[PDB]
């Protein structure tokens, strides 16, 4: 996909962002859902605010032309609908002349829905929020907004939940409780699957990790990146979408014993401050561009949240016990287009 390379570059920017909040605390975030999201939003842009948008999503405005940027996410939207929820919530104030034609473009393209609330009910407007976020997920997440502020006129909301099965599963009867060591010292308790068989692990000189891929019942495969001691930062500097075709190409497989953690992360995220790290500052200031979503009403978009929810199950010589009991990288791909359906480091799975 003519915008795979660029996601994949805007995945990895967002994670080292996001991982220079430290180490112990558990990443995890959906590039694709954070990118449709804001790119949808640019339809509704103009001037500087429409360009720092696509800039900060990692696409050269004088390379490549905004037709394929929203052509690229009109493919990898269309095979994403698998057992994978993703929705886009676009609250705006009642009282406000929308544009018709944002709104047609909005649930044609990206399958996203547009309410109006009355935000002067500052409480009630979170609580209308966070049901939609609760009934689009049918329970998973709930109260996904918990601030909202006084001069709030736009909030744009994007959730995803994921747990889907493996084509391979492993035997719940393996299930067994493991030692976790988030660090040198503290270590934890975690149930941690096991099986014996071939896999399509390797173990990279250059990440200096151990790498394993498997397939999902549908269009993904999870990559996990188990570093050296002591590598867990060289393996998120080395990492770049090169080395992920390298590995989906790679197709040796090998029998190892895997110990492999069942864990259930969530992620939460305030894209206003986070992607105002990559560059994305106007659409969220007094001086927003926003003509396209309503004419003659000034506009801004006063909160952006990301909610990301995964949850991970069973569903001849001496062969390497590999167990992923120490923190360690993983990224999802989408199998057609080859992009990042989420990334994330795991530090505690029991958080």
């Known amino acids: 996909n003519k915008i795979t390379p660029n996601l994949a570059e805007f995945a990895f920017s967002l994670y080292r962002q996001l991982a220079h909040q430290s180490n112990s605390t558990n990443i995890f975030f959906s590039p694709v859902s954070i990118a449709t999201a804001f790119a949808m939003l640019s339809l509704g842009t103009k001037a500087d605010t429409h360009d720092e948008i696509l800039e900060g999503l990692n696409f050269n405005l004088t390379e490549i032309p905004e037709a394929q940027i929203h052509e690229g996410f009109q493919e990898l939207l269309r095979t994403l609908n ?7 919530g676009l609250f705006l104030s009642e009282g406000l002349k929308l544009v018709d034609k944002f709104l047609e473009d909005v649930k044609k393209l990206y399958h996203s829905e547009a309410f109006t609330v009355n935000f002067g009910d500052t409480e009630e407007a979170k609580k209308q929020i966070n049901d939609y976020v609760e009934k689009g997920t049918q329970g998973k997440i709930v109260d996904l907004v918990k601030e909202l502020d006084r001069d709030t006129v736009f909030a744009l909301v994007n959730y995803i939940f994921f747990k889907c099965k493996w084509e391979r599963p492993f035997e719940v009867k393996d299930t067994e ?3 976790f ?11 941690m699957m096991k099986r014996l068989g071939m896999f399509n692990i390797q173990h990279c000189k250059k990440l200096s990790s151990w790498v394993l891929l498997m397939k999902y019942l ?28 390298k590995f989906l190409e790679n197709e040796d497989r090998r029998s190892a014993s895997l110990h492999l953690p069942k864990l259930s992360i969530t992620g939460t995220y305030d894209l206003k401050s986070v992607l105002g790290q ?7 200031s007094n001086g927003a561009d926003l003509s396209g979503v309503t004419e ?20 001849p010589s001496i062969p390497p016990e590999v167990k992923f009991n120490k923190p360690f990288v993983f990224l999802m ?11 994330g480091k795991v530090v505690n799975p029991t958080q």
């Not at 698998?82 to 886009?88: F, I, R, V, W, Y």
């Open 82 to 88: 698998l057992q994978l929820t993703t929705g886009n």
């Open 278 to 284: 990559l560059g994305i500052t106007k659409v969220f």
């Open 181 to 191: 060591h988030v660090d040198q010292v503290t270590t934890v308790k975690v149930p």
């Open 296 to 315: 003659e009403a000034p506009l801004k978009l006063s909160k952006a949240v990301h909610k990301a929810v995964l949850t991970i199950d069973e569903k």
């Open 218 to 245: 549908g269009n993904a495969t999870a990559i996990f990146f188990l570093p050296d001691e002591g590598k867990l930062q060289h393996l998120e500097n080395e990492l770049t979408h090169d080395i992920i075709t």
């Open 177 to 179: 409780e493991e030692d």
């Open 333 to 343: 791909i989408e199998q057609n287009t080859k992009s990042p359906l989420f990334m």
